[PDB]
Amino acid sequence: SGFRKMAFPSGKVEGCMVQVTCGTTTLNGLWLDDVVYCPRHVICTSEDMLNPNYEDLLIRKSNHNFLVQAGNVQLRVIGHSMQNCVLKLKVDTANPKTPKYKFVRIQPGQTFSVLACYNGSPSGVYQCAMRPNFTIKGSFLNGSCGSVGFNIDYDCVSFCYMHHMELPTGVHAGTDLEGNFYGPFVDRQTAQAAGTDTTITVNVLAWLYAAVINGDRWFLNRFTTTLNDFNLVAMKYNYEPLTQDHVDILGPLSAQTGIAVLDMCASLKELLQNGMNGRTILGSALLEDEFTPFDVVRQCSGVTFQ
Amino acid sequence: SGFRKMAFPSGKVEGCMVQVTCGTTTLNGLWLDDVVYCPRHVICTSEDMLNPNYEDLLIRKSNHNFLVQAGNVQLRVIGHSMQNCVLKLKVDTANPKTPKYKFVRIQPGQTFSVLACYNGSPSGVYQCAMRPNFTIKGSFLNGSCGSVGFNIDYDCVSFCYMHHMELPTGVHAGTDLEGNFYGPFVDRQTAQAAGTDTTITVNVLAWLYAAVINGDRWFLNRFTTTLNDFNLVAMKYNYEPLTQDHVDILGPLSAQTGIAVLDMCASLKELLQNGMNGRTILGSALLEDEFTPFDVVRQCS
Ligand SMILES: *[C@H](O)[C@H](C[C@@H]1CCNC1=O)NC(=O)[C@@H]1CCCN1C(=O)[C@@H](NC(=O)OC(C)(C)C)[C@@H](C)OC(C)(C)C
Ligand SMILES: *[C@H](O)[C@H](C[C@@H]1CCNC1=O)NC(=O)[C@@H]1CCCN1C(=O)[C@@H](NC(=O)OC(C)(C)C)[C@@H](C)OC(C)(C)C
Ligand SMILES: [Cl-]
Ligand SMILES: [Cl-]
Ligand code: NA
Ligand code: NA
Ligand code: NA
């Protein structure tokens, strides 16, 4: 038993991280097959960032302007191109440690692991969620750009995030590996801000199920509700709507614990309307929303990766 | 900016995890060079566990009674020895993925990453602390034994924990990699309650410094305290004593933020007296005690 904020094992991703330097900027790249992916803003000076014309800035660069290092070994860049907000540097050597992988775009509410890197060297791993406002609450310093987020299924790494920037409130924004930003953010030095965020209702419910599985039951009650009535409460408390698909996804946890989703929703309604009365749930005094239903099932059943 | 429970990248440890089976029991082993380390209780039946004589049980085992599997490859056991509560299985193949490593026994309050594994394969990685009562608050199921805890400061893996058991209160107990248990626990099915746990004061102070570094000041105050008055108060909340060693180790964070250590202690005293009044610190509504001073410097700088 026990329940922790748990990341995927990061080894398959560690073997893909390299250092990319253009001019005076160093950041990280992802080396898969014979291509290194990194943020396109690596090519910009500070002045360029004010109003960058990335296609003109890139024609001005040559292969030799990009220094790529895998550990102590230099990788020769033999071509370059842009895909949306990501730069693809073709190198002369395919990464012999390339795992089975795919590029996926995730939806708000979905979680993933971040391998925070500096100078091409993995430094730490932690678990995040794509917030409803399309930011992530990361932990990133200067030089972290190009660090990636991922999930694993069996033996396949699904890369879903590449890090590009920090916003004024201290949260983070980035792209999928096809270079499309999550959220209405752009890679230029102009005013931008995180929108008002909301709480990921289906994830809170999943974590309440994790709590019950781990013996924490004090918030259970005799009451149930309807999807329509609970969604009025959710809106009042800046919680995301709960859909029938969310209810269906939580079916396994309901059957296992004997607490129907709408029964658990009546628990969550009372917690929102009345608070915790000084108690905790799974060692938290807040309602945790960065575990998905699948995260709960995975951790509580001991799923492993090959 | 930001502040997360951050584990070390797990790849160097993933490359060391194997499956060990003896009789009907399967757990994980750690394969370093030509040795596989695992909990010695792998050799016990359910009956053996009340009062097992491990020396007597082990002398009866042949090398072929141990099935060791590294991915899809069976490793051949060629000898075995017992060191305290760890079994060392000598195998005929050395692990080509052995990282630079050392074994370190840690003190209460120290943190480490856990790579939770089942059947020799990794499930996930999370951060833990050695509690003052020598338990860890893990996430471990049947078959997780032999999973290890570690740090990887400066490219060398320091192995500090191997998992052996869950206690009735839902926390976890295990050994260093020399097989010595942390705390009063034993690998026997006899009663062995953990002491009342306490909060790791030096770590709470480190986390308050992290909050200041990340831009929050709401909990600061104009007061200070003597060290002894702070300890007299903090102990009434089941906080651990703060020693002069702890004050010294907080010096760099104090210098970076301009908040004297004893002034931060006055902040913590007020937080214990008042609560947060609907506010949060680094996304928590509780005082967090599983980040060390070293961890804060690692992550914020
Ligand atoms: C790439 O390594 C780096 C990662 C950043 C540095 C600090 N923490 C991180 O996550 N990315 C950048 O430095 C990018 C390049 C353009 C500027 N930038 C930022 O992250 C800015 N953000 C910024 O200027 O935001 C707007 C004002 C454009 C909305 C950071 C460094 O500035 C603030 C003031 C810290 C937010
Ligand atoms: C090894 O894989 C396994 C890991 C355990 C299983 C459940 N969670 C874990 O962390 N270790 C064990 O099963 C060991 C072997 C002897 C029994 N044991 C336990 O962990 C017992 N603990 C136990 O008997 O504790 C005492 C009563 C002796 C203090 C667990 C499985 O039993 C309880 C009832 C869950 C505590
Ligand atoms: Cl909390
Ligand atoms: Cl220590
Ligand atoms: Na109910
Ligand atoms: Na016996
Ligand atoms: Na030791």
UniProtKB/Swiss-Prot annotation, chain B:
Record-annotated active site: 41, 145
Localization, UniProt: Host cytoplasm; Host Golgi apparatus; Host nucleus
Domain Peptidase C30 positions: 1-301
Cross-link entry Glycyl lysine isopeptide (Lys-Gly) (interchain with G-Cter in ubiquitin), positions: 5, 90
Residue ranges, Cytoplasmic side: 1-301
Effect of residue 49 to A: Does not affect ability to cleave and inactivate human TRMT1
Record note on what altering residue 132 to H does: In strain: Omicron/BA.1, Omicron/BA.2, Omicron/BA.2.12.1, Omicron/BA.2.75, Omicron/BA.4, Omicron/BA.5, Omicron/BQ.1.1, Omicron/XBB.1.5, Omicron/EG.5.1
Catalytic activity entry: TSAVLQ-|-SGFRK-NH2 and SGVTFQ-|-GKFKK the two peptides corresponding to the two self-cleavage sites of the SARS 3C-like proteinase are the two most reactive peptide substrates. The enzyme exhibits a strong preference for substrates containing Gln at P1 position and Leu at P2 position
Role: Cleaves the C-terminus of replicase polyprotein at 11 sites. Recognizes substrates containing the core sequence [ILMVF]-Q-|-[SGACN]. Cleaves and inactivates human TRMT1, preventing tRNA guanine(26)-dimethylation of tRNAs. May cleave human NLRP1 in lung epithelial cells, thereby activating the NLRP1 inflammasome pathway. May cleave human GSDMD, triggering alternative GSDME-mediated epithelial cell death upon activation of the NLRP1 inflammasome, which may enhance the release interleukins 1B, 6, 16 and 18. Also able to bind an ADP-ribose-1''-phosphate (ADRP).
Quaternary structure and partners: 3CL-PRO exists as monomer and homodimer. Only the homodimer shows catalytic activity. Interacts with host FBXO22; this interaction promotes the proteasomal degradation of nsp5.
Name the UniProt record assigns to this protein: 3C-like proteinase nsp5
Species of the source: Severe acute respiratory syndrome coronavirus 2 (2019-nCoV)
Gene name of the record: rep
Interval of the full protein contained in this chain: 3264 to 3564 of 7096
